[PDB]
Amino acid sequence: ATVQIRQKVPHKRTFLFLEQLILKHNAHVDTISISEAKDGLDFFYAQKNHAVKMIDFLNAVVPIKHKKSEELISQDTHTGASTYKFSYSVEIVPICKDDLVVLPKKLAKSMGNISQFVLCSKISNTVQFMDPTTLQTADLSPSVYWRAPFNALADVTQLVEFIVLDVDSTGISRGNRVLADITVARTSDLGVNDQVYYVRSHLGGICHAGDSVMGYFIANSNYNSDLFDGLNIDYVPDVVLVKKLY
Amino acid sequence: VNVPKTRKTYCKGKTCRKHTQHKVTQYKAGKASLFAQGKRRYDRKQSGFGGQTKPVFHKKAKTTKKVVLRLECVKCKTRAQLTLKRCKHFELGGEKKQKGQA
Amino acid sequence: AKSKNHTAHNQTRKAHRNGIKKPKTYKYPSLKGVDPKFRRNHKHALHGTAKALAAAKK
Amino acid sequence: GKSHGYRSRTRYMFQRDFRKHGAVHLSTYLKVYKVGDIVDIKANGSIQKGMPHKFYQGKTGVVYNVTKSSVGVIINKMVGNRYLEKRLNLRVEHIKHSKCRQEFLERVKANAAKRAEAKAQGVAVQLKRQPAQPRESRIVSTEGNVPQTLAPVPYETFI
RNA sequence: CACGGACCAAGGAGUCUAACGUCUAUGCGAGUGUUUGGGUGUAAAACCCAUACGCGUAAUGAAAGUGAACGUAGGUUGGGGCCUCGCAAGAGGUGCACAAUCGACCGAUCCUGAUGUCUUCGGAUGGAUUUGAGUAAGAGCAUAGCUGUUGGGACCCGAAAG
RNA sequence: GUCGAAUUUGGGUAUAGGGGCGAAAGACUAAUCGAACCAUCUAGUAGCUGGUUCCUGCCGAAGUUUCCCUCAGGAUAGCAGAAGCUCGUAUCAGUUUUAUGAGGUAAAGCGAAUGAUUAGAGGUUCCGGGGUCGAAAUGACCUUGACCUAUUCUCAAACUUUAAAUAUGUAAGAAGUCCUUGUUACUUAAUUGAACGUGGACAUUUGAAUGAAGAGCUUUUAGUGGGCCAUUUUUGGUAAGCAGAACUGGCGAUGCGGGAUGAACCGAACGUAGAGUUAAGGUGCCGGAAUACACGCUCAUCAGACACCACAAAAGGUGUUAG
RNA sequence: GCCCUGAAAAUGGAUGGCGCUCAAGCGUGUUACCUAUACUCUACCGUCAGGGUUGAUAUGAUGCCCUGACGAGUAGGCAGG
RNA sequence: GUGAUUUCUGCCCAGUGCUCUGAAUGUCAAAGUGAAGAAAUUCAACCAAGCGCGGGUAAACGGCGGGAGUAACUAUGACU
RNA sequence: GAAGACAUUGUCAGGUGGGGAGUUUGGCUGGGGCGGCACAUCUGUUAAACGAUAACGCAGAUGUCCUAAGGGGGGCUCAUGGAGAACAGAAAUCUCCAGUAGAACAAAAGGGUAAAAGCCCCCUUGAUUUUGAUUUUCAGUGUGAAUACAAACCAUGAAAGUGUGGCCUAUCGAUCCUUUAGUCCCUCGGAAUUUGAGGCUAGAGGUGCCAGAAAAGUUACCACAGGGAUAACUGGCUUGUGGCAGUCAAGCGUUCAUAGCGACAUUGCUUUUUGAUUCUUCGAUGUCGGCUCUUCCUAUCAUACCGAAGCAGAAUUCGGUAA
RNA sequence: GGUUGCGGCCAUAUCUACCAGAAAGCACCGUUUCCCGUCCGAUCAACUGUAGUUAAGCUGGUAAGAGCCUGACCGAGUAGUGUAGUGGGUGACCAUACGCGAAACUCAGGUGCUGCAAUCU
Numbered sequence A: 001a002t003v004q005i006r007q008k009v010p011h012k013r014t015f016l017f018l019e020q021l022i023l024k025h026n027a028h029v030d031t032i033s034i035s036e037a038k039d040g041l042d043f044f045y046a047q048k049n050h051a052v053k054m055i056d057f058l059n060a061v062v063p064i065k066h067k068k069s070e071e072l073i074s075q076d077t078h079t080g081a082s083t084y085k086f087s088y089s090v091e092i093v094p095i096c097k098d099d100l101v102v103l104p105k106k107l108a109k110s111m112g113n114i115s116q117f118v119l120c121s122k123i124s125n126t127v128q129f130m131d132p133t134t135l136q137t138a139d140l141s142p143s144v145y146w147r148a149p150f151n152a153l154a155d156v157t158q159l160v161e162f163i164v165l166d167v168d169s170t171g172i173s174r175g176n177r178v179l180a181d182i183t184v185a186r187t188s189d190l191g192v193n194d195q196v197y198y199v200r201s202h203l204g205g206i207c208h209a210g211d212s213v214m215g216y217f218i219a220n221s222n223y224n225s226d227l228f229d230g231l232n233i234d235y236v237p238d239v240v241l242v243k244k245l246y
Numbered sequence B: 001v002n003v004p005k006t007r008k009t010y011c012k013g014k015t016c017r018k019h020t021q022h023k024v025t026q027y028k029a030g031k032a033s034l035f036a037q038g039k040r041r042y043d044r045k046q047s048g049f050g051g052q053t054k055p056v057f058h059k060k061a062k063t064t065k066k067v068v069l070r071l072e073c074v075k076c077k078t079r080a081q082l083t084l085k086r087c088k089h090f091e092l093g094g095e096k097k098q099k100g101q102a
Numbered sequence C: 001a002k003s004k005n006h007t008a009h010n011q012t013r014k015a016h017r018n019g020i021k022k023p024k025t026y027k028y029p030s031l032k033g034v035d036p037k038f039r040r041n042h043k044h045a046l047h048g049t050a051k052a053l054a055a056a057k058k
Numbered sequence D: 001g002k003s004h005g006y007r008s009r010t011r012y013m014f015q016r017d018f019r020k021h022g023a024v025h026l027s028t029y030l031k032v033y034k035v036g037d038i039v040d041i042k043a044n045g046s047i048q049k050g051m052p053h054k055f056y057q058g059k060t061g062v063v064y065n066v067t068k069s070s071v072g073v074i075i076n077k078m079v080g081n082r083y084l085e086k087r088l089n090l091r092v093e094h095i096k097h098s099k100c101r102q103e104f105l106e107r108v109k110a111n112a113a114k115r116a117e118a119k120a121q122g123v124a125v126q127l128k129r130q131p132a133q134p135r136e137s138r139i140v141s142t143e144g145n146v147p148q149t150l151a152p153v154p155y156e157t158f159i
Numbered sequence E: 001c002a003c004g005g006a007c008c009a010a011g012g013a014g015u016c017u018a019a020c021g022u023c024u025a026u027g028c029g030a031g032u033g034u035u036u037g038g039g040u041g042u043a044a045a046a047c048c049c050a051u052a053c054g055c056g057u058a059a060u061g062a063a064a065g066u067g068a069a070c071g072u073a074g075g076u077u078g079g080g081g082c083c084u085c086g087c088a089a090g091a092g093g094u095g096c097a098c099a100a101u102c103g104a105c106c107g108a109u110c111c112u113g114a115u116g117u118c119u120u121c122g123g124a125u126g127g128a129u130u131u132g133a134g135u136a137a138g139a140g141c142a143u144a145g146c147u148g149u150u151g152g153g154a155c156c157c158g159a160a161a162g
Numbered sequence F: 001g002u003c004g005a006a007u008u009u010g011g012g013u014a015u016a017g018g019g020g021c022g023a024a025a026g027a028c029u030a031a032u033c034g035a036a037c038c039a040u041c042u043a044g045u046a047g048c049u050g051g052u053u054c055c056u057g058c059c060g061a062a063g064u065u066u067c068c069c070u071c072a073g074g075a076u077a078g079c080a081g082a083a084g085c086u087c088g089u090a091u092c093a094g095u096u097u098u099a100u101g102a103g104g105u106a107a108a109g110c111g112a113a114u115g116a117u118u119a120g121a122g123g124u125u126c127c128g129g130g131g132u133c134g135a136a137a138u139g140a141c142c143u144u145g146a147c148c149u150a151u152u153c154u155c156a157a158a159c160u161u162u163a164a165a166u167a168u169g170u171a172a173g174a175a176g177u178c179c180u181u182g183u184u185a186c187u188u189a190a191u192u193g194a195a196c197g198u199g200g201a202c203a204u205u206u207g208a209a210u211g212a213a214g215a216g217c218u219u220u221u222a223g224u225g226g227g228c229c230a231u232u233u234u235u236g237g238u239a240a241g242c243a244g245a246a247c248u249g250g251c252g253a254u255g256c257g258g259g260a261u262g263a264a265c266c267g268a269a270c271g272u273a274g275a276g277u278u279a280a281g282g283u284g285c286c287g288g289a290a291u292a293c294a295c296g297c298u299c300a301u302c303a304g305a306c307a308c309c310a311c312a313a314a315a316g317g318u319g320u321u322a323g
Numbered sequence G: 001g002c003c004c005u006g007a008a009a010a011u012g013g014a015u016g017g018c019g020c021u022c023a024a025g026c027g028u029g030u031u032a033c034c035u036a037u038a039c040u041c042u043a044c045c046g047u048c049a050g051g052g053u054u055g056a057u058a059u060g061a062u063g064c065c066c067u068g069a070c071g072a073g074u075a076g077g078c079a080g081g
Numbered sequence H: 001g002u003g004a005u006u007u008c009u010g011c012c013c014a015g016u017g018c019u020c021u022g023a024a025u026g027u028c029a030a031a032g033u034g035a036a037g038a039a040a041u042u043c044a045a046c047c048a049a050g051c052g053c054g055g056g057u058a059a060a061c062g063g064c065g066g067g068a069g070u071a072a073c074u075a076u077g078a079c080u
Numbered sequence I: 001g002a003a004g005a006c007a008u009u010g011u012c013a014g015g016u017g018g019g020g021a022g023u024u025u026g027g028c029u030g031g032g033g034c035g036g037c038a039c040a041u042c043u044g045u046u047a048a049a050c051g052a053u054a055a056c057g058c059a060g061a062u063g064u065c066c067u068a069a070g071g072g073g074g075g076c077u078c079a080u081g082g083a084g085a086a087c088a089g090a091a092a093u094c095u096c097c098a099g100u101a102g103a104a105c106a107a108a109a110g111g112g113u114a115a116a117a118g119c120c121c122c123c124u125u126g127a128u129u130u131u132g133a134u135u136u137u138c139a140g141u142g143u144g145a146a147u148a149c150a151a152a153c154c155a156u157g158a159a160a161g162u163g164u165g166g167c168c169u170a171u172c173g174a175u176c177c178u179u180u181a182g183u184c185c186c187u188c189g190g191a192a193u194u195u196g197a198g199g200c201u202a203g204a205g206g207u208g209c210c211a212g213a214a215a216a217g218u219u220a221c222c223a224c225a226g227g228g229a230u231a232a233c234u235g236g237c238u239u240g241u242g243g244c245a246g247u248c249a250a251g252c253g254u255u256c257a258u259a260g261c262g263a264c265a266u267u268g269c270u271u272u273u274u275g276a277u278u279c280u281u282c283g284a285u286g287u288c289g290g291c292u293c294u295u296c297c298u299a300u301c302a303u304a305c306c307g308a309a310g311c312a313g314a315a316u317u318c319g320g321u322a323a
Numbered sequence J: 001g002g003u004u005g006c007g008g009c010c011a012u013a014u015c016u017a018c019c020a021g022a023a024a025g026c027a028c029c030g031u032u033u034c035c036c037g038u039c040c041g042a043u044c045a046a047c048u049g050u051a052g053u054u055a056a057g058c059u060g061g062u063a064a065g066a067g068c069c070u071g072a073c074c075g076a077g078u079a080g081u082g083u084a085g086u087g088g089g090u091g092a093c094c095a096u097a098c099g100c101g102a103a104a105c106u107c108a109g110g111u112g113c114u115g116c117a118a119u120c121u
Helices: A013-022 A049-061 A105-110 B037-046 C011-015 C036-055 D099-121
Strands: A002-006 A031-036 A040-045 A064-072 A084-092 A100-102 A117-120 A127-130 A137-140 A160-169 A180-186 A197-201 A212-217 A239-244 B006-011 B018-026 B066-073 B080-086 D038-041 D060-066 D070-079 D082-091 D095-097
Touching (some): A040 A049, B006 B066, D038 D070, D095 D099
Antiparallel strands (some): A002 A040, A160 A212, A180 A197, A212 A239, B006 B018
């Protein structure tokens, strides 16, 4: 038997989050050996039943799609007996924890009429999105994602260093001190230039003056998605603040 | 990448035929602009019973566009185009590089 | 059903049924590819020497 | 996946030499190539521009075109059941003369010399070459020379 | 130790047409093709004929358009045959077909822009590593045949379906 | 099994095909039902299976390249035929020699560079790389560790100074060499060079060997595009009548003599006949042919007998013979 | 070196069979002999190439005649019947 | 839907569905209206149901797990 | 009586709509699925010393990055080791000597390079225009990348010269459709003007199945053309593994290598295991076990006759002939 | 024959250690106004051939030196290898016939050669 775990991204956050958590709950106890692959890794299981126990564990912690197949080996004629060799192909949802995602138009209208230009927040059993301009969350169960897949707009490797000038909070707060209008300037343009950007962001309370934050920088990026092309350009912000550094 | 806003290159506009100063901006596609020939044929053919009659492209793999620059001469205003390779980050003008810094 | 993908057996014997031969290299080779600074003069050298043989020697 | 690049399988063929690294010597540039000369091709590893493909290493062609830095060389390459006539543009570092042709041009001058000299005498031009002949009969000398007797040796190990 | 065949007579499978390509035969030849039709008749035959039409005699460009001799219709290198001397061997002249090659002219693209001129029309002359399915003392049209192609039920027999 | 009821049954009448009817089985609807029957559209389409009708004569293949929703199929180059055309010593050739190139495998080397393997203990901002939780950073927790901190052997498809054998490129003249001076818008300080030429000189040994059932060009089309085996070099594999490549010969497409028998091995390739001599193998008898000659070895209460080939090992023997 | 032990498979059987023991076994040398659609010579058919022959006496000048070489073949092509 | 009677039928309304005396301008077709234009046209406002937000609903489809501990000779765990 | 310009009916428009219709549901592959990309490419190796050369063979990379990390010129020498200098140590800065590249050159690996192709300065846009020839994969078509020129215009340097992107080898795309730039030229065909539309020329918007379709499942109710080109059963080859037998004899048998147990190493046999393979059969060889019945094998549990013992008897244990 | 300028072939020319060099040429060397460049006239710039030197550079020699280059009845006709056999061997692999034929090592010898222009007891 074999559970084959796969994730298509070059940098796999949830997949490495899986290996740290597979050791905490003491899950892989019934392995024979562990092989690895280009896209993920493989687990070899002696009996049939120990493989299904892992998939019930994987369903709780990471959004997967799985299916099964088999191979015949012996076909003994003296009794009806199997000697079958099973294979479970498991694939993680290919969006990482903190990417930039542009949703499809019909899908974004059903999840509470969120805007299409959202982040990812909390990546869980289910996939959770966040609108960084106005705080509003929307969940995405894996059965809705695999009936119509889509790709991340930008990875973690596109983050750009920013330097914050001050924080102007609007006093709205769901759970993260919503909509602090951060006046932010580029790390690379602070030295010799006078160029200042102006953006609402969910990083409300944790940010002060002179702090280094990372962010997606839309103003120079030529994306080639048809979803991003089917937008209204003058409603797209220049800066999406992602995370505070250090 | 990063290109300067001003580039001195060869112009061909029947009076210059020499390296003159050009301005650099970024090429924009333009409006779809119906009453074109293919659009009037498409709206006639879709009309009626039969549903979708043209292929609709789905399986897209690329992630970048090539970058096109419209070089505009400052004397004769004879615009000319020039292409670049595929790149993810394209800004023009700022961020001049200095190699020795802290 | 797998297949034998590739071999070069019998490929040499097929070529030697017709006897591998030269392109037999004619006189006056074609001046395509010659430096066009040379061809522009070499036109006038032949046009000049045809004038000398016509008028003087008769 | 397979590999069929422009310089594949050229690990040892484009290496420079042992104790001959560095810049090339200046008699490479000073030699003169006229149209029709027989040349040989040996690709230099250091000069990357104008470089012959890995097939033409060691072949021999005729110069038809002379330009600023390079020469035009024709090479007969077989493909299928047919010779083709393919043309290259090699910079002068990669090219060199063929001494087989250069010995031919001085044998013609000797052949013209022997014909003109034998006409002054009047008979027996004798100009073609002949291969190695079986030798003539002769008499060896045992004077101060006794034929030494040999015998096969027995077997020893000394290992 | 794969499938069809118990035995006998009879039937039983690359055909026809439209439009064609190479090749061969015949007529005629800068022309060619009588036969939709008319005239006639010993009556679906044979014979005789006008005017148009078809392909050919000029290509090129998307088009508006423009349209093939500096010359013995060019120079070179071979070239069957022929002509002259010579006993022959060979020597020289002339070389069609044809093969390789440098030019010439016509059209497109790019440049030069003359005498002129409703002042913006006109494009003389000369070029250019470009380009054409071109010109350079025409070779095509019509019929018939083998072979080959495509559409036709298309060598013959055969579905589960619609 | 049931047998006085949700019972059995006659006649009448109603519902008809993507419809009816169903106390539900995808059951029944005239021996037809996970969609009836009849006729037409129809000779439906098939890259798939079977068949394809007279004789002799000459020539005679392919399972390979590139591209394709392509891998049981086509185009395309290859091999093959036919029609021939210009010419007839043309200079070509699956070859050698003289001369001169190129290469990095066999073998060599490790006291010439480069060099693995099996294992792996510590040192808490000399880093964090991959996470994770955080009203933040003097901020926490988990982990691979960052670090090998001390020496210790190994040789080599992916290590190298030198470097074979076989195979491989070019040259051996007339389209050449030499004097001489013509051409130009190129080139040179320069009638210097370059390139192509006039006129003159060098011919039968004209520039090594051997061969040349003529040399050269062109049009057009059939079949094929499932291969297989053997010696040698090899890769995956415990090994295979296994899988995948290299040069060459075969079988397929092919009989005949020999290996009793055999698609490939050994001889040898074919019109019909007579005579002679042989190959591969054989000569006690079946069986054509010496129970021939000569020198030795072996006796087995499972002897041994001829390549590919239908087998046999390590370890023992005062069995015999030579050392 | 030969032989022997090592050496065990299921229908009855295989140096090819009988059989063979100073071999009709193994090693080796010398001769003789047997025979293939192969090789040499000849006859004949056929194809291909190079030739001769309209004074005439032909009635087949797509005829008659001289010399030489070669002949396997599925798929396929052409040709004569 | 379930399948005599006796005896019971626990917890979850969020996911998917269904539904309402609920909020109002996020989405938003044709016809209409306005502006620009020589005119075909372009542009902008307005904008029904539905969707979106909010509530209800398990004898509707269904679901009912993870991490500690906290003892009485020898232990599951009431609790968190 | 009720209802009343609302309902109803007609046309267009948006929502809902497996209730119903039509079609689709890639390829390679040691069966098919799952995986994987071996499907478009690059370096080393396999590869057997020119080139070519396969496998789901091995060690790996690419769908990027750069106004400098492009172009030109000048100046200079690195990794590391040794010896010295307050705080200063294993590591700061400074100095000298030695230093063939042991460094660096955006990245995979392999080449290449020392008054440079590395490091630091100075100036610049040749990373430009016009189109042809040529190399690589090759059908001598495309596409990508690359070389050498010509005609223009410039950059740099005192100058010779060098530069048509990255030191070289990978870093990417047809038809139709839309769109911008060019000459601001051609056409809208009864003749004009102006909007609009269509053309020539050169780019971009993309087909990763990368010479380029627009596409989810299930069948245990199943159907047809076929395949031994291909699975599940017997047979054949192979023997890692299994059974089994030799040799070598560690530990044991209270003190004794072999009476007798015997692991581990090493050489073999068998087809009574399990694997590997695809040769025969898919126009069918009826595919488990039991009951019934014959015969064969010996690797002997019993029986017959013997040998050895740590065999006194009794009871055993080990070995031979023998089915 | 010695120098210098410019090279050609690129270790027989380099490397390490000591010694010798008349003549002239080189080279060290003296100064900072100017052109010019640096933290520093050290490097490069300019200025004088003047104050002075062969101490270095440079050239030549010596070393049973390290390296490098030629050879040889050195190793060795050995390793490998092309063809052939109904050759041996259960095999692994090995002999023969016609052929090509190395490398390390060992010893012996060598330690730059030359083109153009100028100038020197």
